[PDB]
mmCIF file of C-alpha atoms and ligand atoms in Angstrom:
data_model
loop_
_atom_site.group_PDB
_atom_site.id
_atom_site.type_symbol
_atom_site.label_atom_id
_atom_site.label_comp_id
_atom_site.label_asym_id
_atom_site.label_seq_id
_atom_site.Cartn_x
_atom_site.Cartn_y
_atom_site.Cartn_z
ATOM 1 C CA UNK A 1 -2.866 15.612 -0.915
ATOM 2 C CA UNK A 2 -3.815 14.881 -4.588
ATOM 3 C CA UNK A 3 -6.183 12.243 -6.152
ATOM 4 C CA UNK A 4 -5.890 10.291 -9.362
ATOM 5 C CA UNK A 5 -7.056 11.999 -12.666
ATOM 6 C CA UNK A 6 -10.753 11.839 -12.717
ATOM 7 C CA UNK A 7 -10.848 10.616 -8.940
ATOM 8 C CA UNK A 8 -11.425 6.926 -9.373
ATOM 9 C CA UNK A 9 -12.657 5.185 -6.311
ATOM 10 C CA UNK A 10 -14.109 2.048 -4.856
ATOM 11 C CA UNK A 11 -18.196 2.158 -5.547
ATOM 12 C CA UNK A 12 -19.029 -0.203 -2.941
ATOM 13 C CA UNK A 13 -19.279 -0.604 0.880
ATOM 14 C CA UNK A 14 -16.889 -3.645 1.021
ATOM 15 C CA UNK A 15 -13.576 -3.942 -0.854
ATOM 16 C CA UNK A 16 -11.971 -7.409 -1.012
ATOM 17 C CA UNK A 17 -8.389 -8.187 -1.162
ATOM 18 C CA UNK A 18 -6.215 -11.281 -1.372
ATOM 19 C CA UNK A 19 -2.359 -11.529 -0.748
ATOM 20 C CA UNK A 20 -1.383 -13.766 -3.701
ATOM 21 C CA UNK A 21 2.491 -14.085 -2.814
ATOM 22 C CA UNK A 22 4.800 -13.602 0.166
ATOM 23 C CA UNK A 23 8.099 -12.371 0.606
ATOM 24 C CA UNK A 24 10.879 -14.486 2.176
ATOM 25 C CA UNK A 25 11.902 -11.805 4.557
ATOM 26 C CA UNK A 26 8.957 -12.404 6.864
ATOM 27 C CA UNK A 27 6.902 -14.836 8.401
ATOM 28 C CA UNK A 28 3.321 -15.098 6.484
ATOM 29 C CA UNK A 29 1.451 -14.060 9.437
ATOM 30 C CA UNK A 30 3.396 -10.951 9.841
ATOM 31 C CA UNK A 31 2.582 -9.855 6.409
ATOM 32 C CA UNK A 32 -1.280 -10.686 6.927
ATOM 33 C CA UNK A 33 -1.171 -8.792 10.143
ATOM 34 C CA UNK A 34 0.659 -5.969 8.899
ATOM 35 C CA UNK A 35 -1.646 -5.671 5.321
ATOM 36 C CA UNK A 36 -4.729 -5.739 7.767
ATOM 37 C CA UNK A 37 -2.943 -2.909 10.119
ATOM 38 C CA UNK A 38 -2.330 -0.958 6.884
ATOM 39 C CA UNK A 39 -5.702 -1.244 5.562
ATOM 40 C CA UNK A 40 -7.425 -0.290 8.513
ATOM 41 C CA UNK A 41 -5.311 2.823 9.103
ATOM 42 C CA UNK A 42 -7.455 4.447 6.190
ATOM 43 C CA UNK A 43 -10.428 2.153 7.005
ATOM 44 C CA UNK A 44 -10.881 4.050 10.312
ATOM 45 C CA UNK A 45 -11.172 7.292 8.573
ATOM 46 C CA UNK A 46 -13.961 6.291 5.953
ATOM 47 C CA UNK A 47 -17.057 4.266 5.558
ATOM 48 C CA UNK A 48 -15.407 1.296 3.351
ATOM 49 C CA UNK A 49 -14.877 -2.060 4.813
ATOM 50 C CA UNK A 50 -12.230 -4.627 3.759
ATOM 51 C CA UNK A 51 -12.608 -8.646 3.456
ATOM 52 C CA UNK A 52 -9.554 -11.005 2.674
ATOM 53 C CA UNK A 53 -10.287 -13.810 0.178
ATOM 54 C CA UNK A 54 -7.918 -16.689 -0.230
ATOM 55 C CA UNK A 55 -8.580 -17.797 -3.927
ATOM 56 C CA UNK A 56 -9.907 -16.232 -7.141
ATOM 57 C CA UNK A 57 -10.104 -12.600 -7.926
ATOM 58 C CA UNK A 58 -10.337 -9.664 -5.386
ATOM 59 C CA UNK A 59 -10.664 -5.900 -6.073
ATOM 60 C CA UNK A 60 -7.125 -5.438 -4.490
ATOM 61 C CA UNK A 61 -4.403 -8.228 -5.341
ATOM 62 C CA UNK A 62 -1.246 -8.186 -3.050
ATOM 63 C CA UNK A 63 1.970 -9.512 -4.339
ATOM 64 C CA UNK A 64 5.602 -9.481 -3.988
ATOM 65 C CA UNK A 65 7.860 -9.659 -7.228
ATOM 66 C CA UNK A 66 11.226 -9.254 -8.338
ATOM 67 C CA UNK A 67 12.091 -7.862 -11.983
ATOM 68 C CA UNK A 68 9.530 -8.085 -14.748
ATOM 69 C CA UNK A 69 6.100 -9.814 -13.410
ATOM 70 C CA UNK A 70 3.538 -9.331 -16.398
ATOM 71 C CA UNK A 71 2.390 -5.609 -15.521
ATOM 72 C CA UNK A 72 4.737 -3.666 -17.799
ATOM 73 C CA UNK A 73 6.345 -1.908 -14.663
ATOM 74 C CA UNK A 74 9.338 -4.154 -13.967
ATOM 75 C CA UNK A 75 10.940 -3.800 -10.689
ATOM 76 C CA UNK A 76 14.469 -2.736 -10.655
ATOM 77 C CA UNK A 77 16.534 -4.530 -7.753
ATOM 78 C CA UNK A 78 17.565 -3.326 -4.345
ATOM 79 C CA UNK A 79 16.655 0.336 -3.620
ATOM 80 C CA UNK A 80 15.225 2.953 -6.202
ATOM 81 C CA UNK A 81 11.535 1.952 -6.488
ATOM 82 C CA UNK A 82 10.285 0.061 -3.610
ATOM 83 C CA UNK A 83 6.865 -0.883 -4.795
ATOM 84 C CA UNK A 84 3.816 0.294 -6.691
ATOM 85 C CA UNK A 85 0.018 -0.071 -6.915
ATOM 86 C CA UNK A 86 -2.684 1.113 -9.218
ATOM 87 C CA UNK A 87 -5.623 3.547 -8.843
ATOM 88 C CA UNK A 88 -9.240 1.662 -8.143
ATOM 89 C CA UNK A 89 -10.611 -0.202 -11.285
ATOM 90 C CA UNK A 90 -11.002 -3.540 -12.803
ATOM 91 C CA UNK A 91 -7.799 -5.847 -13.712
ATOM 92 C CA UNK A 92 -4.809 -4.375 -12.502
ATOM 93 C CA UNK A 93 -6.669 -1.465 -10.872
ATOM 94 C CA UNK A 94 -6.285 -1.321 -7.028
ATOM 95 C CA UNK A 95 -3.344 -4.089 -7.070
ATOM 96 C CA UNK A 96 -0.331 -3.413 -4.927
ATOM 97 C CA UNK A 97 3.080 -4.944 -5.924
ATOM 98 C CA UNK A 98 6.138 -4.964 -3.427
ATOM 99 C CA UNK A 99 9.928 -5.565 -4.862
ATOM 100 C CA UNK A 100 10.851 -8.815 -3.463
ATOM 101 C CA UNK A 101 14.595 -7.433 -4.188
ATOM 102 C CA UNK A 102 14.222 -5.159 -1.136
ATOM 103 C CA UNK A 103 15.001 -6.426 2.398
ATOM 104 C CA UNK A 104 11.473 -5.922 3.847
ATOM 105 C CA UNK A 105 11.034 -5.717 7.866
ATOM 106 C CA UNK A 106 8.369 -5.425 10.542
ATOM 107 C CA UNK A 107 10.691 -2.764 12.240
ATOM 108 C CA UNK A 108 12.840 -5.153 14.331
ATOM 109 C CA UNK A 109 15.669 -5.060 11.657
ATOM 110 C CA UNK A 110 17.687 -2.864 9.352
ATOM 111 C CA UNK A 111 15.889 -2.627 6.108
ATOM 112 C CA UNK A 112 12.278 -1.360 4.555
ATOM 113 C CA UNK A 113 9.671 -1.239 6.783
ATOM 114 C CA UNK A 114 6.669 -3.174 5.336
ATOM 115 C CA UNK A 115 3.935 -1.558 7.195
ATOM 116 C CA UNK A 116 5.025 2.086 6.477
ATOM 117 C CA UNK A 117 5.269 0.740 2.584
ATOM 118 C CA UNK A 118 1.975 -0.974 2.654
ATOM 119 C CA UNK A 119 0.228 2.054 4.333
ATOM 120 C CA UNK A 120 1.435 4.100 1.419
ATOM 121 C CA UNK A 121 0.662 1.693 -1.347
ATOM 122 C CA UNK A 122 -2.674 0.694 -0.068
ATOM 123 C CA UNK A 123 -3.430 4.599 -0.106
ATOM 124 C CA UNK A 124 -2.987 4.416 -3.767
ATOM 125 C CA UNK A 125 -5.171 1.333 -4.064
ATOM 126 C CA UNK A 126 -7.998 3.400 -2.454
ATOM 127 C CA UNK A 127 -7.527 6.395 -4.923
ATOM 128 C CA UNK A 128 -4.798 8.558 -3.223
ATOM 129 C CA UNK A 129 -2.178 10.266 -5.324
ATOM 130 C CA UNK A 130 0.918 11.706 -3.900
ATOM 131 C CA UNK A 131 1.385 14.470 -1.509
ATOM 132 C CA UNK A 132 3.765 17.634 -1.242
ATOM 133 C CA UNK A 133 3.841 17.625 2.411
ATOM 134 C CA UNK A 134 7.096 15.907 3.474
ATOM 135 C CA UNK A 135 5.263 14.685 6.553
ATOM 136 C CA UNK A 136 2.339 12.761 4.595
ATOM 137 C CA UNK A 137 2.558 9.122 4.428
ATOM 138 C CA UNK A 138 1.391 9.684 0.653
ATOM 139 C CA UNK A 139 4.632 11.600 0.049
ATOM 140 C CA UNK A 140 6.678 10.248 -2.613
ATOM 141 C CA UNK A 141 9.901 9.173 -1.066
ATOM 142 C CA UNK A 142 10.576 6.909 1.989
ATOM 143 C CA UNK A 143 12.233 7.763 5.226
ATOM 144 C CA UNK A 144 11.289 11.493 5.892
ATOM 145 C CA UNK A 145 9.771 10.892 9.361
ATOM 146 C CA UNK A 146 10.149 7.650 11.322
ATOM 147 C CA UNK A 147 8.884 4.363 9.720
ATOM 148 C CA UNK A 148 8.736 2.860 13.270
ATOM 149 C CA UNK A 149 6.574 5.608 14.641
ATOM 150 C CA UNK A 150 3.973 7.185 12.462
ATOM 151 C CA UNK A 151 0.315 7.582 11.591
ATOM 152 C CA UNK A 152 -1.570 9.047 8.708
ATOM 153 C CA UNK A 153 -1.139 13.132 8.599
ATOM 154 C CA UNK A 154 -4.205 15.446 8.523
ATOM 155 C CA UNK A 155 -3.358 15.820 4.817
ATOM 156 C CA UNK A 156 -3.609 11.853 4.191
ATOM 157 C CA UNK A 157 -6.999 11.933 6.175
ATOM 158 C CA UNK A 158 -8.016 14.832 4.359
ATOM 159 C CA UNK A 159 -7.617 13.467 0.821
ATOM 160 C CA UNK A 160 -9.158 9.795 1.657
ATOM 161 C CA UNK A 161 -12.194 11.666 3.286
ATOM 162 C CA UNK A 162 -12.650 13.868 0.331
ATOM 163 C CA UNK A 163 -12.745 10.726 -1.907
ATOM 164 C CA UNK A 164 -14.940 8.669 0.429
ATOM 165 C CA UNK A 165 -16.719 11.066 3.044
ATOM 166 C CA UNK A 166 -16.139 10.466 6.784
HETATM 167 C C1 RSS B 201 7.115 5.848 -0.413
HETATM 168 C C2 RSS B 201 7.708 4.282 -0.676
HETATM 169 C C3 RSS B 201 7.390 3.098 0.330
HETATM 170 C C4 RSS B 201 7.126 3.834 -2.184
HETATM 171 C C5 RSS B 201 7.465 4.522 -3.224
HETATM 172 C C6 RSS B 201 6.792 4.100 -4.795
HETATM 173 C C7 RSS B 201 5.573 4.677 -4.709
HETATM 174 O O1 RSS B 201 5.091 6.038 -4.824
HETATM 175 O O2 RSS B 201 4.377 4.104 -4.695
HETATM 176 C C8 RSS B 201 9.021 4.604 -3.602
HETATM 177 O O3 RSS B 201 9.773 3.235 -3.720
HETATM 178 N N1 RSS B 201 10.027 5.788 -3.733
HETATM 179 C C9 RSS B 201 11.055 5.954 -3.839
HETATM 180 C C10 RSS B 201 11.726 6.918 -4.408
HETATM 181 C C11 RSS B 201 12.847 7.351 -4.854
HETATM 182 C C12 RSS B 201 13.909 7.970 -4.283
HETATM 183 N N2 RSS B 201 15.069 8.054 -5.023
HETATM 184 C C13 RSS B 201 14.884 7.121 -6.112
HETATM 185 C C14 RSS B 201 15.740 6.653 -7.033
HETATM 186 C C15 RSS B 201 15.281 6.052 -7.988
HETATM 187 C C16 RSS B 201 13.960 5.757 -8.161
HETATM 188 C C17 RSS B 201 13.127 5.884 -7.227
HETATM 189 C C18 RSS B 201 13.632 6.600 -6.157
HETATM 190 C C19 RSS B 201 16.548 8.370 -4.348
HETATM 191 C C20 RSS B 201 17.145 7.233 -3.846
HETATM 192 C C21 RSS B 201 16.473 6.403 -2.550
HETATM 193 C C22 RSS B 201 15.831 5.006 -3.008
HETATM 194 C C23 RSS B 201 15.115 4.113 -1.981
HETATM 195 C C24 RSS B 201 13.868 4.810 -1.584
HETATM 196 N N3 RSS B 201 13.102 4.974 -2.619
HETATM 197 C C25 RSS B 201 11.724 5.733 -2.500
HETATM 198 O O4 RSS B 201 11.619 6.213 -1.469
HETATM 199 CA CA1 CA B 202 -7.684 -5.290 -9.024
HETATM 200 CA CA1 CA B 203 13.716 -1.704 -5.954
HETATM 201 ZN ZN1 ZN B 204 3.931 -4.606 -10.928
HETATM 202 ZN ZN1 ZN B 205 3.249 6.709 -4.120
#
């Protein structure tokens, strides 16, 4: 595992999150259930706790976007970069954006598995950098293992606990 330079991390017991926009590929309830599932995958290993808010600012802002969307990291259409997220901090810090040009799926169709992608991006939102281990969720590319049958590897778990303790 690797952390971001200077090891930024949320310095609070509770971290809020808000899903600002949705994809047209999935029911809204599925995105909510899956973001929750994803946050709690990391949540179970550490002392942090998460709370969803539906208006205003939250530490982690989640949204879907195609192309340019204000943050200077324009998406690029289907394929290539699937999504991106930012190290803990204020403003853009902690946010996770998913490329709406991708065919997102919960796993029952051909496309990009949103739970797998969200676990990876929220790992970045919590402070995780990339892994050299092809099997870790934090590995830089999608599809080495099985998007529909996976779990955090010992490498992912070691890194998150190095950042927030057990
Ligand atoms: C892990 C994931 C959920 C989030 C990451 C983004 C991130 O690290 O947060 C991601 O999108 N990685 C690219 C990395 C990537 C692979 N290639 C690329 C070609 C161009 C640009 C990027 C890539 C080769 C071609 C395949 C393109 C489709 C799959 N893309 C990827 O795996
Ligand atoms: Ca933020
Ligand atoms: Ca893309
Ligand atoms: Zn963005
Ligand atoms: Zn990444």
